[PDB]
């Protein structure tokens, strides 16, 4: 049935329903490409002020806490149906948490099937191309045009967002080139309050 097997949820629910009523101001984050190398260097800063707490869609076991708390799992923004989340909890630093949590990011190339964050720029132009790596990009469907003396297609505007998969042939163009345009990491979605929403705005700063 439930509550069985290896790595039991009945020893996780002691953290997933009990310490989820002892906090003031929380950060709905994004764990869609975040490492454990980049996570251990942000889970030592939060450890003194709070915790990095998520049951990951075990959290509809929070419906029994909503008797007097009136805590929304679906009534707030980002209705939690298409993504992964690991929400950030704080006791001491409920206020200046948004600055070290958005510093330790690393820019890196993406792969195929990644969750495609809001700031992705395709490597293009003269500096974003070799004359030898054209024959890989010459394999694809789209025909090329000559701009600034190079077999290349230019796309520097944002075309993809969270919820659309990246094609498979686009991954090697980020991996082989040194072009890492965006420094990605944790992404705050909603600033959550104990029964309401504190800030219903996004702030990546």
């Amino acid at each position: 049935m439930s509550g069985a097997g290896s790595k039991r949820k009945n020893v996780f629910i002691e953290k997933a329903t009990k310490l989820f009523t002892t906090y003031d101001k929380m950060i709905v984050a994004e764990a869609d490409f975040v490492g454990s190398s980049q996570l251990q260097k942000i889970r030592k800063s939060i450890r003194g002020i709070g915790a990095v707490l998520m049951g990951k869609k075990t959290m509809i076991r929070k419906v029994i806490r909503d008797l007097a708390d009136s805590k929304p799992e679906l009534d707030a923004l980002n209705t939690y149906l298409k993504q992964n989340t690991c929400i950030i909890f704080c006791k001491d630093n409920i206020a200046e948490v948004k600055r070290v949590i958005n510093t330790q990011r690393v820019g890196a190339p993406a792969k195929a099937g990644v969750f495609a964050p809001n700031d992705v720029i395709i490597p293009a132009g003269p500096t974003g191309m070799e004359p030898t790596q054209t024959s890989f990009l010459q394999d694809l469907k789209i025909a090329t045009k000559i701009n600034r003396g190079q077999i290349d297609i230019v796309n520097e505007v944002h075309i993809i967002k969270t919820g659309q998969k990246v094609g498979a042939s686009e991954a090697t163009l980020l991996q082989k080139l040194n072009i890492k345009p965006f420094t990605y990491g944790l992404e705050p979605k909603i600033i959550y309050d104990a029964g309401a929403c504190y800030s219903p705005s996004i702030s990546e700063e």
């Binding site: 394999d139 025909a143 090329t144």
Partner: protein, 185 residues
Amino acid sequence: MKVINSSRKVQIPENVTVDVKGRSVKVTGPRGTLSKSFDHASVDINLVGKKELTVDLWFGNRKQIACIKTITSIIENMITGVTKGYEYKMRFVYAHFPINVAVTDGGRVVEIRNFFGEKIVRRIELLDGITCYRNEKAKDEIVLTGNSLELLSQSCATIQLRSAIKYKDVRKFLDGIYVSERNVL
């Protein structure tokens, strides 16, 4: 046990029109007409107005239940071939001998000379919906393109099968014309 009813549903896009008359499905798309019979099934192929096509089977067990998903996916192949037909990409791998490839468009045939330094000319016709052309952009690659998957992939498989090293050790030589990509648009 044979289940009472086991159906599927095929979604017809708005530019495609199916003309089915007793297990004889005939799509018509913008880019070309395609048809296949399914007279080897006890199946009532049947369309719901304009947008749906419902393969159904009353009292099938297995070897019959297993066939409705097959003949649903084949109609889906016929549909996708007549909206945005399949285009296969085939690449030349050789050790030392550069493979030459000829192509005309009478029967759209391919002719494969200097394969492993063999002097026999590997003239091969394509199945009767298919054309092909060399990739000027990517080196050592010929892209196949067509309207039906059972014609296109079979033409590609005949190119690939007829491009083998015989009487040798196939783990080392690896000279041939293999299917690389299997795109649609």
